[PDB]
Structure formats: C-alpha cells, structure tokens
Amino acid sequence: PEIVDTCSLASPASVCRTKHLHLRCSVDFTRRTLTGTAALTVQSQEDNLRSLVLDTKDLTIEKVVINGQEVKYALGERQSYKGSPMEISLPIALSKNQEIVIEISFETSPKSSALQWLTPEQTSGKEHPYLFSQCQAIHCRAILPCQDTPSVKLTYTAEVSVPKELVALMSAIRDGETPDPEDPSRKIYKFIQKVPIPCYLIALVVGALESRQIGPRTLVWSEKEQVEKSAYEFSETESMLKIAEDLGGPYVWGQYDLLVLPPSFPYGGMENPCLTFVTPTLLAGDKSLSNVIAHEISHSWTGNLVTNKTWDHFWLNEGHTVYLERHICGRLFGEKFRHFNALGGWGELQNSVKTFGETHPFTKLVVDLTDIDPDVAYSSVPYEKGFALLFYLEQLLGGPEIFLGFLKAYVEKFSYKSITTDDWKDFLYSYFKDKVDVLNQVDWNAWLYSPGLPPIKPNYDMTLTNACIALSQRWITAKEDDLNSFNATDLKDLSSHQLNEFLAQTLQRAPLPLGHIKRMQEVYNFNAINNSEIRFRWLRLCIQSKWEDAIPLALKMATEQGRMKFTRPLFKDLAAFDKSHDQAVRTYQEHKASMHPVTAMLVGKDLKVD
Ligand SMILES: NCCCC(=O)Nc1ccc(OCc2ccccc2)cc1
Ligand SMILES: [Yb+3]
Ligand SMILES: [Zn+2]
C-alpha cells in the first residue's frame, strides 16, 4: 500500500528523509568506543512535522543540538535486535521539503553489533590493534543514530581522529590526512561520499594498514604480512571492472579499493562503496576464488545504485549481483564455466531448502522479516533462488544478450533509487512489452512467494560438471572392491572449481562409510589443500562421516577464521557428532569473547547455549 520497513523503528521515508550525514568522531581503542557528532540533514515530506524518530542500539546519547541550542529527546524501551527508538522534539514545525540539521553527539557501546575491536594479539603484525564495521543489514544504528532503512539514501562527509600510527579508511573517497588540532598523538583522516547511498553501506576500518597499486583505480589495503599475497590474488580486478561497466554502464564511485580484513570478518565480502571488504579466506594463492571480487564489483550497480527498498526485497540485491558475477566470470573463462557455476548455485539452493525445510518461510524469494532478526534469516536463498529466476528468464526471453539489455536498462532506470519486487517486475513487463505473452507463462506466485525449490529448473550445459558427477557417484556407490581402483589420477583433469563441486556433490549424500572417507584422504590427500572452499566441504564430509581425526582440523578451521559461511556449519557438524560435541561447545565458550559479535550470537544460537 504505502510501504513500511518492518526492521526499522525510525520515521519512514514518507514522513522525512535523511539527505546527508556529517560525521566527526574519534576512535578510542582503550575504551573501545567511537565518540563524536552525527549531524543529519533531514527533509520533511509532510507539513507540520513536529518530531521524528531515529534508530539506535546500545548508543549513549550525550547531547542533541538543533539550531545552536539543545533539544528534548526520548529513548523508548529496547525492542530486541531492533534496538531502542529515539524520538526527537523539533523546535520548529517543519513543512513540505523544508530541511533541518539535527546534530546528535554520541558514544558507541564496546559491544556494538556493528563493530569488532581486535587486540594486537588478534592481528598479523601483533603490535597494533584494529577496528572494522559491518553495518549490513541493520547495525548502522549501533554506530550512530539514523533512519536505518535502505529506503533512504544519503550522501555523507566524515572526519575521524585515530591514533597517529594507524590508518582510517571509509566507504568514500579519501579527502586527505592531517595532524589533529585538539590533541597531537592522533591524525584526522577525512572522507567524502557524493553518491547517495543507503546507511548499511557506511563503513570504517582502522589499523596498521599499508596499500599496494594493482590497477588504475584500485589499491589493495591490508597489513604488511598479507599485502603481497593479495596483490597477486586480486590482479584480475581491473579487468573485471571493465567487463562490469560494459554490462552495467558507467562505474560512478570514483575509486574501487579492496580491503583484506582480519580472519574474523564474517562474510566473503561486503560491497562498501569505493572500498570493498573481503575475507582473507580468498587468499588461496591461485586466484581461484576471484568470483567473490566479481560479485563485489557487481554490487557497484545492483545493490549500491539500485537498492532493495526493504530487506524483504533483498533478493533484488543479491539475485542480480550473482547474475552479473557469473557473466563476468563467463567473459573471462567461457560460457561453459558460467553454466558450471550456475548449476553449482542450484546445488547450494538445494542444500538451503533441505536445511530450512521445503515449507519454511525463509525459502521464499520475497520474505517477511516482521519480528525476525535479519542476521538469522540470512542464507543462500535470496542469492540462488534469485539467480535461478533471472537465469530462467534469460532462457525464456531469448538468451543472455537480450537479458543483459534488460539488466543495463533496469540499472539505468532505478539508479540512485530504492525499489521493491513490484518495481522490478513492472519494469520487466515494460521493457519486454513485445513478449508479454511469454512473461505470462511465468508462475510468478510460485517463484516469488512459494517456499522450496522453484517450480521450474533452468537448462544447464554439463560439459564441466560431468566429470564431477561421475566421480561423486563412483564414491557414493562404492563398495569394498572399488576402493583400490581410486587413485590420484582421478583428479588429473579437474580444476579446483571441479574438486570443490565434486566434494559438494559427495557431501549431499553424507555420511559415507568411514573406511571410504579414509581411503579418499589416502588417494587424494585433501588434507593438504588450503583453498578454504574446498577444505570447508572436505571437513564437513569428514565430520559428518564420523572421522575423529578430522575433529581437530575442523575446530582449527572454525576458530582460526570466522567467515560465517564456514564457521557456522563446522560448529554445527562438530556439535552433531557425539565424539566432538563437548569440545565443540567448550571451544565456543572459550573463543566467544574474542569473536565478532554477530558471529558469536549466531554460533551460540546454533549450539543452543546460554
Ligand atoms: N551483501 C554483502 C554480504 C553481507 C550481507 O548481505 N549481509 C546481510 C544481508 C541481508 C540480511 O538480512 C535480510 C535478509 C535475509 C534473508 C532473506 C532476505 C533478507 C542480513 C545480512
Ligand atoms: Yb563391485
Ligand atoms: Zn552480494
């Protein structure tokens, strides 16, 4: 009707709108707090606007300055993962389009769900601490007060004081560094973002950061120790950027920097404008996990330019991005590779539907997050059910060239806007008006609103998948007399991508007999492989098949890195295996204070502790 964001307690975009944020703050590593001022330019959309509501979580409100003086504010009671509402009394009754600056001084709790503060022990260099944010989905409200909904877009400017030996970086173009006036011993790093973004894309890192040039508009940022390994790993970036512009239109953000974060960073990447954050688990040393870079580049259009209006429509962000990602890798390595990766995607979707259950609400494409913590709903479903829909539609409407024309125009039309599934679908019909009859063969109700597997499977080239299936199946159906025929030559012609897919297929049918999984380690030596995607699935397969020797390997992987994609299922498998159950829980209890806060709360929920 007139859409409301159910994950926000803030006044909606239909009442007022944040157009800009000015951010002055200092990063205190001893108190583990961000202190400062957050000045919001807000614009009324109705007449007689006498007060507005902002989202907060564990925020200490020092003062709220409007037009020079101090004003009357009022924090409501805590509302769970959502935090507490901050209703602000305005001294002037605002009328249509009239703007106002609400300057709000503030401190962040040390247990901010947006932030992980690391000690020197937890870093590579061992001598300096570190900070990083991760605002998506609704954690920006835990760094500063805001309409913490992606239905609102705002430019922002920032100045941030940090210990003089550490570097700050933000999701913005760097606007110079200068010694701090108020107290030496600290620099003040300055930042500006002229493209209006949703607040989930505001982002901050602070640490012993060096850089390295790997393309005309790209430096990799990490700690001394990883900088070199990473320059090698993400060399393909500029070439990916070029393809992405041919598919998406002009890359408008100015810079595309990459930041390789500490092992505890909870996702494969986060698409922070001008500075993409990635897991060091990408550092396989052969560029084989560069699809993740492809994916983050693509968010510079689908996500960051065209944005889900609410998190219910999150598939728009991820479905499109995965579609662009797979085009990028297709251009670089061939159409048969794009189909290989698309089919694996369907396989991940099958695992998601089986894990949640086929009638589960989070297997729907468009969801309802009323009273659900977004972090708990998060999964592969919006990624792979979304991709599957786009892929099916590509095939139905006359193929990738024709569908990529829809894509670029879709991006062009909704650029700098926040939109829903209906905006997307209404534009699909508009663009493809000469094929409306074809569009009406789509079971829109099933695809969009029904749980489980999609009602139709797309068509996939098999070239590269067949070798994975033959071998997965040989193992799944092996008896005693087959075990001596397996041999390291079985892998002679398989890429790392195919080893991974082979293990993914085998894992779908776990458990295998213990003797079989031992034999697999003997002929193939998967223990020696450091590729995190491969090691992950191999250790799942081992634990789920009751192999005790895999226990210390799986505990090591689950705690020495904390990308949730790997950490969560390794903990869960370890907990379901009777031999490792107690050690899994104890390991969790002993690590949970030095863990990222969203990851710690999720692993705790998975392990049914507290
Ligand atoms: N996009 C970069 C990776 C981080 C990320 O996407 N985080 C994130 C996204 C959505 C979310 O919650 C909303 C949701 C979950 C599942 C389905 C639909 C919406 C929570 C975290
Ligand atoms: Yb046999
Ligand atoms: Zn994404």
DSSP summary character for residue 401:
H
Residues 6+ apart with CB under 8 A from 260: 220, 221, 222, 226, 230, 278, 279, 280, 282, 283
Cis upstream peptide for 554 (omega within 30°): no
321 CA: nearest ligand 1 atom: 1
Distance CA 542, CA 548 (A): 8
Q: Which residues line ligand 1 (CB under 6 A)?
A: 136-137, 267, 270-271, 311, 314, 367, 374-375, 377-379, 382
382 CA: nearest ligand 1 atom: 17
- What residues form DSSP beta bridges with 197? 154
Which residue minimizes the CA distance to atom 5 of ligand 1? 136
Instruction: Tell me which residue of 9, 8, 157 sits closest to 75, measured CA to CA.
Output: 9
User: At how many degrees (to 10) do helices 400-414 and 237-248 cross?
Assistant: 80
Distance CA 6, CA 460 (A): 38
| 499, 339 Cβ separation under 8 angstroms | no
Total Cβ atoms within 10 A of residue 267: 19
| 388, 458 Cβ separation under 8 angstroms | yes
| 543, 574 Cβ separation under 8 angstroms | yes
For CA atoms 384, 390, 391, 392, the dihedral sign is positive
User: What is the whole-number distance in angstroms between the Cα of residue 140 and the centre of ligand 2?
Assistant: 59
Spell out a b/e string for 409-444, using b for 16 or more CB atoms within 10 Å of the CB, else e. Answer: ebbeebbeebbbbebbeebbeebbeeeeeebeebee
| 374, 138 Cβ separation under 8 angstroms | yes
Instruction: Tell me which residue of 401, 355, 363, 305 sits closest to 568, measured CA to CA.
Output: 355
- What residues form DSSP beta bridges with 23? 38, 158
Instruction: Tell me which residue of 9, 275, 79 sits closest to 168, measured CA to CA.
Output: 275
Outline where DSSP puts E strands in 274-327: 275-278, 306-308
Q: Which residue numbers are catalytic? A: 296, 383
User: What is the whole-number distance in angstroms between the Cα of residue 277 and the centre of ligand 1?
Assistant: 15
Tokens 């760097």 -> residue = 174
Tokens 């998060």 -> residue = 378
Which ligand ends up closest to the CA of 267? 1
| 569, 540 Cβ separation under 8 angstroms | yes
**Binding-site annotation, residues for Zn(2+):** 295, 299, 318
Which residue minimizes the CA distance to atom 7 of ligand 1? 136
What is the chain's Cα-based Rg?
Answer: 25
Q: 193, exposed or middle or buried, with CB in 10 Å at 0-12, 13-18, 19+?
A: buried
Which residue minimizes the CA distance to atom 16 of ligand 1? 378
**Cα pseudo-dihedral 44, 49, 51, 52, rounded to 10:** -30
Question: Which technique?
Answer: X-ray
Distance CA 460, CA 448 (A): 22
Which residue minimizes the CA distance to atom 2 of ligand 1? 270
User: What is the whole-number distance in angstroms between the Cα of residue 268 and the centre of ligand 2?
Assistant: 42
User: What is the whole-number distance in angstroms between the Cα of residue 477 and the centre of ligand 2?
Assistant: 9
Instruction: Tell me which residue of 87, 64, 68, 67 sits closest to 77, measured CA to CA.
Output: 87
Distance CA 8, CA 14 (A): 13
Which ligand ends up closest to the CA of 266? 1
**Binding-site annotation, residues:** 134-136, 266-271, 295, 299, 318, 563-565
299 CA: nearest ligand 1 atom: 1
| 292, 258 Cβ separation under 8 angstroms | no
Q: Which of 136, 271, 316 to mutate to test the pocket of ligand 1 (most atoms within 8 A of CB)?
A: 136
User: What is the whole-number distance in angstroms between the Cα of residue 268 and the centre of ligand 3?
Assistant: 9
User: What is the whole-number distance in angstroms between the Cα of residue 295 and the centre of ligand 3?
Assistant: 6
Residues 6+ apart with CB under 8 A from 582: none
Tokens in use for 215? Answer: 């393309």
Tokens in use for 23? Answer: 């951010």
375 CA: nearest ligand 1 atom: 20
Tokens 């614009």 -> residue = 43
Which residue minimizes the CA distance to atom 9 of ligand 1? 137
Tokens in use for 567? Answer: 């950490």
Tokens in use for 143? Answer: 């760094």
Residues 6+ apart with CB under 8 A from 440: none
- In angstroms, what is the resolution? 2.2
Instruction: Tell me which residue of 594, 509, 608 sits closest to 130, measured CA to CA.
Output: 594
Q: What is the DSSP string of 105-150?
A: EEEE-TT-TTEEEE-GGGSSSSSS-EEEE--TTTTGGGTS-B--ST
Instruction: Tell me which residue of 411, 449, 392 sits closest to 303, measured CA to CA.
Output: 411
**Binding-site annotation, residues for a peptide:** 134-136, 266-271, 563-565
User: At how many degrees (to 10) do helices 314-333 and 421-431 cross?
Assistant: 50
Tokens in use for 173? Answer: 């173009």
| CA distances (Å), origin 602, targets 122, 225, 304, 569 | 21, 30, 26, 11
Residues 6+ apart with CB under 8 A from 339: 460, 461, 462, 463, 464
Tokens in use for 479? Answer: 């008896």
Antiparallel, parallel or unpaired: β 33-44 and 16-28: antiparallel
Instruction: Tell me which residue of 348, 328, 352, 347 sits closest to 338, measured CA to CA.
Output: 328
Which ligand ends up closest to the CA of 320? 3
Q: Which domains does the chain have, with CATH numbers?
A: 15-207 (2.60.40.1730), 208-304 (3.30.2010.30), 305-461 (1.10.390.10), 462-610 (1.25.40.320)
Q: What is the DSSP string of 204-251?
A: EEEES-EEEEEETTEEEEE-HHHHHHHHHHTTTHHHHHHHHHHHH---
DSSP summary character for residue 361:
G
> Coil, helix or strand for 43?
strand
Which residue minimizes the CA distance to atom 15 of ligand 1? 378
Sheet holding 257-260, edge to edge: 210-215, 218-222, 257-260, 275-278, 269-270
Q: Which of 311, 349, 352 to mutate to test the pocket of ligand 1 (most atoms within 8 A of CB)?
A: 311
Which ligand ends up closest to the CA of 483? 2
Distance CA 285, CA 274 (A): 24
User: What is the whole-number distance in angstroms between the Cα of residue 89 and the centre of ligand 2?
Assistant: 79
315 CA: nearest ligand 1 atom: 18
Residues 6+ apart with CB under 8 A from 413: 427
Q: Which residues surround ligand 3, an ion (CB under 5 A)?
A: 318, 321
Q: Which of 302, 366, 378, 381 to mutate to test the pocket of ligand 1 (most atoms within 8 A of CB)?
A: 378
